[PDB]
mmCIF file of C-alpha atoms in Angstrom:
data_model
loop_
_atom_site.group_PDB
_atom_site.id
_atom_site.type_symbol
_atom_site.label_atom_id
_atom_site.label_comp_id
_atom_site.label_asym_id
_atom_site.label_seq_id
_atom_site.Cartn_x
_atom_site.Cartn_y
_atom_site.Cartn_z
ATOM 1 C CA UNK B 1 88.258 131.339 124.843
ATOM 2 C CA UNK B 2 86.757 127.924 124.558
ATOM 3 C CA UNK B 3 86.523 125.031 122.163
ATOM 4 C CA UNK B 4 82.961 123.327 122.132
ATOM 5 C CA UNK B 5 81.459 120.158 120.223
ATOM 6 C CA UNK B 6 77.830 119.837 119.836
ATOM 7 C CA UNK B 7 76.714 116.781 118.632
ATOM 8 C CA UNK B 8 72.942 116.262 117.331
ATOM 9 C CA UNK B 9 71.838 113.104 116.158
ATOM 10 C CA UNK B 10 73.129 113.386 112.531
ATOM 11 C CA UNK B 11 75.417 116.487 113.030
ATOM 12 C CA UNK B 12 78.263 117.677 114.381
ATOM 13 C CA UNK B 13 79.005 121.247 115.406
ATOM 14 C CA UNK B 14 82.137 123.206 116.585
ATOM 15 C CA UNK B 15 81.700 126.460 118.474
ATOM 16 C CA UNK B 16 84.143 128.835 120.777
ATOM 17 C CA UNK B 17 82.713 130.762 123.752
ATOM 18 C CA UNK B 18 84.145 133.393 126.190
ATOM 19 C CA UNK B 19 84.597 132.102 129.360
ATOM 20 C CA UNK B 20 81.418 134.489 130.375
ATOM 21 C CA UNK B 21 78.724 132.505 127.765
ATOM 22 C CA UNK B 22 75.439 131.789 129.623
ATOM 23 C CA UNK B 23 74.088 128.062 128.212
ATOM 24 C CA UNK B 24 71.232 130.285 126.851
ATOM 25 C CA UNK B 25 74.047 131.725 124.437
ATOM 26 C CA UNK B 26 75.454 128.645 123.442
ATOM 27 C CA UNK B 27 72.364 127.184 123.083
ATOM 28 C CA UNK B 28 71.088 130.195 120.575
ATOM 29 C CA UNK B 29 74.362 129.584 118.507
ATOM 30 C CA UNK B 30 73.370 125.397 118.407
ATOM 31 C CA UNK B 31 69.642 126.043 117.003
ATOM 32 C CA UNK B 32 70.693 128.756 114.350
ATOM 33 C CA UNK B 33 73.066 126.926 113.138
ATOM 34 C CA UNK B 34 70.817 124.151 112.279
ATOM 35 C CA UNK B 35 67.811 126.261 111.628
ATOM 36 C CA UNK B 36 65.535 124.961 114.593
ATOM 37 C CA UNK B 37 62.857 127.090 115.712
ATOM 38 C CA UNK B 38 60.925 124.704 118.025
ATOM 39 C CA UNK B 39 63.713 124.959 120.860
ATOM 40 C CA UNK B 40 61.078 124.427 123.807
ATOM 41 C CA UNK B 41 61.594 121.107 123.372
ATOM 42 C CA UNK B 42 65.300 120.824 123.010
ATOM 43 C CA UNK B 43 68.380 120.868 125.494
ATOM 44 C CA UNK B 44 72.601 119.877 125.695
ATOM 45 C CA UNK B 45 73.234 117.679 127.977
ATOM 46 C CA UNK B 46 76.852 116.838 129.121
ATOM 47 C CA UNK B 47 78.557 114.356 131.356
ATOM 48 C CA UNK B 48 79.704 115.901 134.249
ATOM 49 C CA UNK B 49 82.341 115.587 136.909
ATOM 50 C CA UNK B 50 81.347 112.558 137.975
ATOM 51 C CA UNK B 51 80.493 110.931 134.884
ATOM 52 C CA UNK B 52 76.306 111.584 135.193
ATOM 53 C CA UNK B 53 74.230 112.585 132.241
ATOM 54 C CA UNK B 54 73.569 116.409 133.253
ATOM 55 C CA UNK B 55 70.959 119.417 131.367
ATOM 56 C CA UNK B 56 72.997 122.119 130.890
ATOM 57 C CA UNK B 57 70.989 125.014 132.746
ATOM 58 C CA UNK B 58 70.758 128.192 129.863
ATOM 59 C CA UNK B 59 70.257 130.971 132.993
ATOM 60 C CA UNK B 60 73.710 130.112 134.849
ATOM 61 C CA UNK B 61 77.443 130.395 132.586
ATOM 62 C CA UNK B 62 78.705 127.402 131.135
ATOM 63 C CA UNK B 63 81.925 127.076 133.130
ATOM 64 C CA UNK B 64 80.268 127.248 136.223
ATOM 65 C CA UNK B 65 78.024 124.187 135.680
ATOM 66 C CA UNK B 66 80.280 120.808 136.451
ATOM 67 C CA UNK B 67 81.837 120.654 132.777
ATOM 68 C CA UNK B 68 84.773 118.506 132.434
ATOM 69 C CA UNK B 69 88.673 119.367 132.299
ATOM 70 C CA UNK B 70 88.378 118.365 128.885
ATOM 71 C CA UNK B 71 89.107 120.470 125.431
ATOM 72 C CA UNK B 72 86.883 120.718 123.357
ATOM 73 C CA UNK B 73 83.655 120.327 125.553
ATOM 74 C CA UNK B 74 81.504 117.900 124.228
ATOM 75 C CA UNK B 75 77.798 118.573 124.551
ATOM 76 C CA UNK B 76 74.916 116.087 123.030
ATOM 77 C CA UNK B 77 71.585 118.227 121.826
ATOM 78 C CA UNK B 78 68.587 116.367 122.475
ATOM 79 C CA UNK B 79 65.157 116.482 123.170
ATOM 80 C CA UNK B 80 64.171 117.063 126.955
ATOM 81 C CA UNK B 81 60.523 117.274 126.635
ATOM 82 C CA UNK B 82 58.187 115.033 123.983
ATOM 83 C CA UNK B 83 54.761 117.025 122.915
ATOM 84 C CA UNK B 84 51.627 115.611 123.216
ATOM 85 C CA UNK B 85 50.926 114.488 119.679
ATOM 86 C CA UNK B 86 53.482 115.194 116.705
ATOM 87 C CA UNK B 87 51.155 115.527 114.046
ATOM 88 C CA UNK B 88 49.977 119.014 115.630
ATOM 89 C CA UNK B 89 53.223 120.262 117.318
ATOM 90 C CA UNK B 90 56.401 119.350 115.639
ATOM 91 C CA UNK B 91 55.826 122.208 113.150
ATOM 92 C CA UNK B 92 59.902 121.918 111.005
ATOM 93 C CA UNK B 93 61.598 119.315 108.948
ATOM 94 C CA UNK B 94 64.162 119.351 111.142
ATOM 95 C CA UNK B 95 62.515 119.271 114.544
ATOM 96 C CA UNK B 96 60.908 115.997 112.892
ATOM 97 C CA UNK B 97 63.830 114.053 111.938
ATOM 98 C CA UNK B 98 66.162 114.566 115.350
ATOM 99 C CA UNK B 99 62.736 113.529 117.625
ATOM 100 C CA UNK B 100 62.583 110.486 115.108
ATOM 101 C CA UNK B 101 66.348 109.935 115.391
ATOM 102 C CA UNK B 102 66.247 110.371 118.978
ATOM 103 C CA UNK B 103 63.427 108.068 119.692
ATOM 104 C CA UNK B 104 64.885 105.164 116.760
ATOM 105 C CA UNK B 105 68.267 105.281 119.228
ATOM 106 C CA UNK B 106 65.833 103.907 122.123
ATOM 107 C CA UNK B 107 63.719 101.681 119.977
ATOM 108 C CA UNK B 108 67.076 99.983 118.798
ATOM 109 C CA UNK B 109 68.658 100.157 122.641
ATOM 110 C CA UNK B 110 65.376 98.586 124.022
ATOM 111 C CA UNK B 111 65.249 101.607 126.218
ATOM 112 C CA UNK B 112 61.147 102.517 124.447
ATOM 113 C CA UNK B 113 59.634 98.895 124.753
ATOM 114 C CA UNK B 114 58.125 98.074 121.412
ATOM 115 C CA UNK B 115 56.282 94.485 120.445
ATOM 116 C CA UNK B 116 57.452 92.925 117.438
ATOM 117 C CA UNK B 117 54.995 93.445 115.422
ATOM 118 C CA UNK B 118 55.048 97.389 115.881
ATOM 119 C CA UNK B 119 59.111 97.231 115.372
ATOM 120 C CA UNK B 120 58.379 95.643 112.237
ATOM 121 C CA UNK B 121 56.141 98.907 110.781
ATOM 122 C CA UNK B 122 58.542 101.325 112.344
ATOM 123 C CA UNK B 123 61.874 99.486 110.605
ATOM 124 C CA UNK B 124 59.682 100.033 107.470
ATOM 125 C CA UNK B 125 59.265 103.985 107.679
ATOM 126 C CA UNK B 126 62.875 104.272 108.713
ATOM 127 C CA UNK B 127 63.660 101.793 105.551
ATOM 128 C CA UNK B 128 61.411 104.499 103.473
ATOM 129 C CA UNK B 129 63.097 107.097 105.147
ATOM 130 C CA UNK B 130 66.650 106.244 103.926
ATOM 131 C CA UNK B 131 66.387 104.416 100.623
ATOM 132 C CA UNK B 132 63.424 106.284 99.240
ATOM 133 C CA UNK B 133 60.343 104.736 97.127
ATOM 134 C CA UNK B 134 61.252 99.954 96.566
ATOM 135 C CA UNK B 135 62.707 99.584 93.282
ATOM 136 C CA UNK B 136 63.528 95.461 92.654
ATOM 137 C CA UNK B 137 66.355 96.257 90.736
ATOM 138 C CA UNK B 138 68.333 97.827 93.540
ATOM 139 C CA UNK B 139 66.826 96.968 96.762
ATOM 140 C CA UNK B 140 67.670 93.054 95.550
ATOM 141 C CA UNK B 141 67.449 90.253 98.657
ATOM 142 C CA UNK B 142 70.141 90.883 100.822
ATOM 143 C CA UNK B 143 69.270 95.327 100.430
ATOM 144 C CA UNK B 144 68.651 95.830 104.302
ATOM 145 C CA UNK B 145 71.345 93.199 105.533
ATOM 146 C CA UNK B 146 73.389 95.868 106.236
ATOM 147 C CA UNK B 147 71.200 97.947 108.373
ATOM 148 C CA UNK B 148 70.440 98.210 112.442
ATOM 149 C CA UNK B 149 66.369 98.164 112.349
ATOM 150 C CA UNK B 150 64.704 95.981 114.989
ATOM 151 C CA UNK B 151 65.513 96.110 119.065
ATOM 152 C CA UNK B 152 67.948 93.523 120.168
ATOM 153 C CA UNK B 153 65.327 92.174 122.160
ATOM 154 C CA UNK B 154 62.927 91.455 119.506
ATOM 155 C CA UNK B 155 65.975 89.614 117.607
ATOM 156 C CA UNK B 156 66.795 87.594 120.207
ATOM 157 C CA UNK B 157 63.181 86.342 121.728
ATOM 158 C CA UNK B 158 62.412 85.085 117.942
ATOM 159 C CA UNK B 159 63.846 82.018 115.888
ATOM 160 C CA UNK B 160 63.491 83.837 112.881
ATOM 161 C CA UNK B 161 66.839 84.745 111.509
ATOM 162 C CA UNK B 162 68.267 87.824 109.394
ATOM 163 C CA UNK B 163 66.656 87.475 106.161
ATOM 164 C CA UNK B 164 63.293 86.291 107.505
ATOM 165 C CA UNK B 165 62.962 89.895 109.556
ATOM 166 C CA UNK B 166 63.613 91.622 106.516
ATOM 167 C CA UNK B 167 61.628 90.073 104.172
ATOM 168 C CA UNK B 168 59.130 91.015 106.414
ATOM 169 C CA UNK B 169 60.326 94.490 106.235
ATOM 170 C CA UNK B 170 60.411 94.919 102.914
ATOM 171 C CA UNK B 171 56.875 93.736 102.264
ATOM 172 C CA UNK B 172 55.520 97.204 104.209
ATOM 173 C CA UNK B 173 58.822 99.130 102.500
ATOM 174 C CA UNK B 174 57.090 98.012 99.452
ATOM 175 C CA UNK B 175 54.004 99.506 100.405
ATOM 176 C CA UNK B 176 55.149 102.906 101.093
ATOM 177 C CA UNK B 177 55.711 103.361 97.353
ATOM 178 C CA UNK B 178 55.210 107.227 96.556
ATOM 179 C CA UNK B 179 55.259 108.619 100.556
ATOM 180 C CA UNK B 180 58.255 111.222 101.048
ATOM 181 C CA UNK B 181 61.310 110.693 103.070
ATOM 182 C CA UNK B 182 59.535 113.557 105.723
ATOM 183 C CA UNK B 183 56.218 111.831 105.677
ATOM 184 C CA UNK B 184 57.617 108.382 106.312
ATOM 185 C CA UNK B 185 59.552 110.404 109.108
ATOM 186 C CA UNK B 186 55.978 111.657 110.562
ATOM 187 C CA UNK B 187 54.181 108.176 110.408
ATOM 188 C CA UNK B 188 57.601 106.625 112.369
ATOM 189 C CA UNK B 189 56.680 109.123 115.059
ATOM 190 C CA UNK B 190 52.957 108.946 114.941
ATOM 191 C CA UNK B 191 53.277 104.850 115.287
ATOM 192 C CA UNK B 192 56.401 105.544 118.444
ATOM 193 C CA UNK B 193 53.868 107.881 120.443
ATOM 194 C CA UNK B 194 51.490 105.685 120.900
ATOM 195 C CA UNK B 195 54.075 103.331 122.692
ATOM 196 C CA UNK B 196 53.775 102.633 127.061
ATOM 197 C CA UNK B 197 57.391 103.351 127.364
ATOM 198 C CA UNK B 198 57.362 106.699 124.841
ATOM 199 C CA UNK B 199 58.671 110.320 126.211
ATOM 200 C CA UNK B 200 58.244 108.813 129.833
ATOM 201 C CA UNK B 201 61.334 109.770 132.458
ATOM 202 C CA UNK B 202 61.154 106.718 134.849
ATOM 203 C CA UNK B 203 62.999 106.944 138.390
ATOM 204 C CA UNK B 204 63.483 104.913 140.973
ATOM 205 C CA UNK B 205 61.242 105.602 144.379
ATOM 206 C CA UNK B 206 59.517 104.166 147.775
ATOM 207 C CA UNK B 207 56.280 104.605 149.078
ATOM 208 C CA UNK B 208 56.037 105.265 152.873
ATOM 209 C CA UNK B 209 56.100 101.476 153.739
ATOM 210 C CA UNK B 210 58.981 100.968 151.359
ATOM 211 C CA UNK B 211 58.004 98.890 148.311
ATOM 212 C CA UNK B 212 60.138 100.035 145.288
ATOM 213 C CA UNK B 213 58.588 101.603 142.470
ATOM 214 C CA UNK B 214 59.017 104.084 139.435
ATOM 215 C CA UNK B 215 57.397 107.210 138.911
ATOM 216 C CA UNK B 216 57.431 108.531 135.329
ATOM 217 C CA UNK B 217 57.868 112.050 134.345
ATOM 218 C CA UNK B 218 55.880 113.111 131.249
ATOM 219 C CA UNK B 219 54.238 115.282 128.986
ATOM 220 C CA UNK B 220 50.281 114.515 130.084
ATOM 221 C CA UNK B 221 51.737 113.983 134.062
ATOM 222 C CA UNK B 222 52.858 111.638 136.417
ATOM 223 C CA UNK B 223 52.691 108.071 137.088
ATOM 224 C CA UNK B 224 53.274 105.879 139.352
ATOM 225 C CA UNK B 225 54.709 101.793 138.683
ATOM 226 C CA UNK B 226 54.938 98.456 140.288
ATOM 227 C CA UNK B 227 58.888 98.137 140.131
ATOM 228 C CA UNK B 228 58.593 94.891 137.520
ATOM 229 C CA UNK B 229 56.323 96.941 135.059
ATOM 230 C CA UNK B 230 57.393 100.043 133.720
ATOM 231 C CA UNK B 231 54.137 99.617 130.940
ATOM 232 C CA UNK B 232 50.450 100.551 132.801
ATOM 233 C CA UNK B 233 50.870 102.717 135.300
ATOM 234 C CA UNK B 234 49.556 101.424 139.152
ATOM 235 C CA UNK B 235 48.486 105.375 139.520
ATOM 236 C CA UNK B 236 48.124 108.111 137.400
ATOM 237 C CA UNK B 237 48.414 112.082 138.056
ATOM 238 C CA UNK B 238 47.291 114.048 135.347
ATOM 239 C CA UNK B 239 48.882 117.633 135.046
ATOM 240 C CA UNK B 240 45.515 118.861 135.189
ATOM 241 C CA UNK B 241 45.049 117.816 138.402
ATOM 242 C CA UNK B 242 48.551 119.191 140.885
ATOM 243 C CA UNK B 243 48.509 121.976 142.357
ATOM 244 C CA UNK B 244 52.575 121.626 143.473
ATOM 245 C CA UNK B 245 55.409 119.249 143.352
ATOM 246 C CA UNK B 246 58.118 119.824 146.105
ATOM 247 C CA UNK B 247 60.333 117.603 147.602
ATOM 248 C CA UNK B 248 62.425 118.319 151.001
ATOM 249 C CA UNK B 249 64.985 115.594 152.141
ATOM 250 C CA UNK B 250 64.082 112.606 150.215
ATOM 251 C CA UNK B 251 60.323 112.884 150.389
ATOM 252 C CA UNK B 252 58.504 114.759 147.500
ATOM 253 C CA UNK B 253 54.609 115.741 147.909
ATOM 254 C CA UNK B 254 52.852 115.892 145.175
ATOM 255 C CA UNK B 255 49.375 118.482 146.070
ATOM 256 C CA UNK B 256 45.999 118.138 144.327
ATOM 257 C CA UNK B 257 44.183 120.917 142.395
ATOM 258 C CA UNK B 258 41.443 119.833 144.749
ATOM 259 C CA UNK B 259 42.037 120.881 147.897
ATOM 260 C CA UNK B 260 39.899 118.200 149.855
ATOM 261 C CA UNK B 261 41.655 115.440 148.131
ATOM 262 C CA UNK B 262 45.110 114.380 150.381
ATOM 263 C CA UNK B 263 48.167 114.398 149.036
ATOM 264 C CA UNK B 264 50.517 112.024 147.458
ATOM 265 C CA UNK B 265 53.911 111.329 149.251
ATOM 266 C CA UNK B 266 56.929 109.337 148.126
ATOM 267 C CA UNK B 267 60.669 108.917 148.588
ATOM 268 C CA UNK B 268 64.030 109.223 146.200
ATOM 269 C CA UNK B 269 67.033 108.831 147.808
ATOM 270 C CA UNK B 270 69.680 111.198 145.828
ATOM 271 C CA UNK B 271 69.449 115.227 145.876
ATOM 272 C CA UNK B 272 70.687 115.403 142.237
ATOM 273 C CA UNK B 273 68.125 112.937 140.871
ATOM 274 C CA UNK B 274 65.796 114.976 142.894
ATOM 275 C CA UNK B 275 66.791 118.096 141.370
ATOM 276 C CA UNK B 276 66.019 116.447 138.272
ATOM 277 C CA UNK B 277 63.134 115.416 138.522
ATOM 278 C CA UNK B 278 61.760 118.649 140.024
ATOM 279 C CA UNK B 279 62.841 120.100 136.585
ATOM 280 C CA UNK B 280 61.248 117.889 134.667
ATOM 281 C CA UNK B 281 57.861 118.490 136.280
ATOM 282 C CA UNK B 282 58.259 121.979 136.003
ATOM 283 C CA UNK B 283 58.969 121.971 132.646
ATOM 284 C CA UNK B 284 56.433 119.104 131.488
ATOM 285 C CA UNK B 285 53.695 120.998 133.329
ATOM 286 C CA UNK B 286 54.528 124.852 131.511
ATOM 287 C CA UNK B 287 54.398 122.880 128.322
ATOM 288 C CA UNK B 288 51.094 121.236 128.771
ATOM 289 C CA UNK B 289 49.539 124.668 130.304
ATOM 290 C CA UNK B 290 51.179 126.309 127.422
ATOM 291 C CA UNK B 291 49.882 123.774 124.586
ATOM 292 C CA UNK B 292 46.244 124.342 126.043
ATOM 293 C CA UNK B 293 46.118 127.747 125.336
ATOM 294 C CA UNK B 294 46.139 128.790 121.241
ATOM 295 C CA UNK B 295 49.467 129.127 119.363
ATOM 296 C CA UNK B 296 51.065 132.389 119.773
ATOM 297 C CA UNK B 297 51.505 134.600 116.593
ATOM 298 C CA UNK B 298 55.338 133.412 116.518
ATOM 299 C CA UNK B 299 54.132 129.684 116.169
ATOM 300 C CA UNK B 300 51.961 130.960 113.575
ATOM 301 C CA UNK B 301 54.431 132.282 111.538
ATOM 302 C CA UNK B 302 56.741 129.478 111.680
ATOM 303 C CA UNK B 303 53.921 127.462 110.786
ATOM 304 C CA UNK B 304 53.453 129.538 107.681
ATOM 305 C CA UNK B 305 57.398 129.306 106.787
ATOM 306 C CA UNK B 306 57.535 125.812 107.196
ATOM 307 C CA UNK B 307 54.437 125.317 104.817
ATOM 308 C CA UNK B 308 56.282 127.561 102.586
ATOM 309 C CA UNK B 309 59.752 125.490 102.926
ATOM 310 C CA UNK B 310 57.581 122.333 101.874
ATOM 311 C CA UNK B 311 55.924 124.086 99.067
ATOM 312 C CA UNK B 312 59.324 125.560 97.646
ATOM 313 C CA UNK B 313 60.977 121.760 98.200
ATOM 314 C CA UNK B 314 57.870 120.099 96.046
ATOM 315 C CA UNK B 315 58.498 123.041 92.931
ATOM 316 C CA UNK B 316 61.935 122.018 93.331
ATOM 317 C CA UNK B 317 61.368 118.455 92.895
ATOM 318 C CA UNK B 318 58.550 118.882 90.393
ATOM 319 C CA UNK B 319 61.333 120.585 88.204
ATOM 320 C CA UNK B 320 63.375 117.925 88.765
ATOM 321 C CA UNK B 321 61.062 114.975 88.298
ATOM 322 C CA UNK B 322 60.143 116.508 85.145
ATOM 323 C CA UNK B 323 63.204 117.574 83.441
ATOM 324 C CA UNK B 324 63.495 113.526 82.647
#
């Protein structure tokens, strides 16, 4: 049997598998353990072989996929697939805070562009997030030196040094006076979705001529980039509108719901970024179908338990609050 390590953004987990386990298996064991429900959106990913970021497949066994020699093997659970608005679809505590942890790691990494003046109002929900409610006694000059909250690039481009960035912080920290750890989790992730660079895949591409661009994988379709601006899309293929994605030998067609319109061709040079990519439509696409038609009853009811959870924590904290 086999050691595993699962690492989610603020956990770690240990696991051992028969040599048999199906990802599907180990993946069950991951989201009960942490008590996530919402697992559509979710995956492990694993460096391979070769070193390359790889999705674990569930439907194939885990030894079989190109898993290191190593012991234990190290897995990273992440988010795969970004919904269309969080407010209506990231239903669990949980499911909240590792999208919001997830997408903070590329705010900080400028991997998710983000102007300055938006990184200040996110550093401020993530500031709510992990002190809780501005109190001047404690949260004295100096309270957020410590902390990673703007991109690097944001720092640098600026003249403004430490403690002018978070004095600016702390005058919207100061401002979120009375919101709840969660809800200052929510408005962090209602502010990052509205970002150019949010939940999109980018990869690197030709047209039939040859000028270098990006396509972007995500949740509402595809698009298409000049290769020096990953931000507005040059084209745009809503999911409502392909019929097919394929790709044979470098070139990947991409058919119209319309039949009379042509199709779109272009060209990415590596099979297992192809592979990749293919997945990614597939799965974007079932997800947008999917969010189009009305919750099933299971949504429903986790819905109702996570309502219920929120209720219970308030009573809880009520007591609590009162008891002094």
């Amino acid at each position: 049997t086999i050691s595993v390590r699962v690492t989610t953004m603020d956990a770690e987990l240990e696991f051992a598998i028969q040599p048999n386990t199906t990802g599907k298996q180990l993946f069950d064991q991951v989201v009960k353990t942490i008590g996530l429900r919402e697992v559509w959106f979710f995956g492990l990913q694993y460096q391979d072989t070769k070193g390359f970021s790889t999705w674990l497949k569930l439907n194939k066994k885990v030894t079989a996929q190109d898993v290191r020699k190593e012991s234990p093997l190290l897995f990273k659970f992440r988010a795969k697939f970004y919904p269309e608005d969080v407010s209506e679809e990231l239903i669990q505590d949980i499911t909240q805070r590792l999208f919001f942890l997830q997408v903070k790691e590329g705010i900080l990494n400028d991997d998710i562009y983000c102007p300055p003046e938006t990184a200040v109002l996110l550093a401020s929900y993530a500031v709510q997030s992990k002190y809780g409610d501005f109190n001047k006694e404690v949260h004295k000059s100096g309270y957020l030196a410590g902390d990673k909250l703007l991109p690097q690039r944001v720092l640098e481009q600026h003249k403004l040094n430490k403690d002018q960035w978070e004095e600016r912080i702390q005058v919207w920290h100061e401002e979120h006076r009375g919101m709840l750890r969660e809800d200052a989790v929510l408005e962090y992730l209602k502010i990052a979705q509205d970002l150019e660079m949010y939940g999109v895949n980018y990869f690197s591409i030709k047209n039939k001529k040859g000028s270098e661009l990006w396509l972007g994988v995500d949740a509402l379709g595809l698009n298409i980039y000049e290769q020096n601006d990953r931000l507005t899309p040059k084209i745009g293929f809503p999911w409502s509108e392909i019929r097919n994605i394929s790709f044979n030998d470098k070139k990947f067609v991409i058919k119209p719901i319309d039949k009379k319109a042509p199709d779109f061709v272009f060209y990415a040079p590596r099979l297992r970024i192809n592979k990749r990519i293919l997945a990614l439509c597939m799965g974007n696409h079932e997800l947008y179908m999917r969010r189009r038609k009305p919750d099933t009853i299971e949504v429903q009811q986790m819905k109702a338990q996570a309502r219920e959870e929120k209720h219970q924590k308030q009573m809880e904290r009520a007591m609590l609050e009162n008891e002094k």
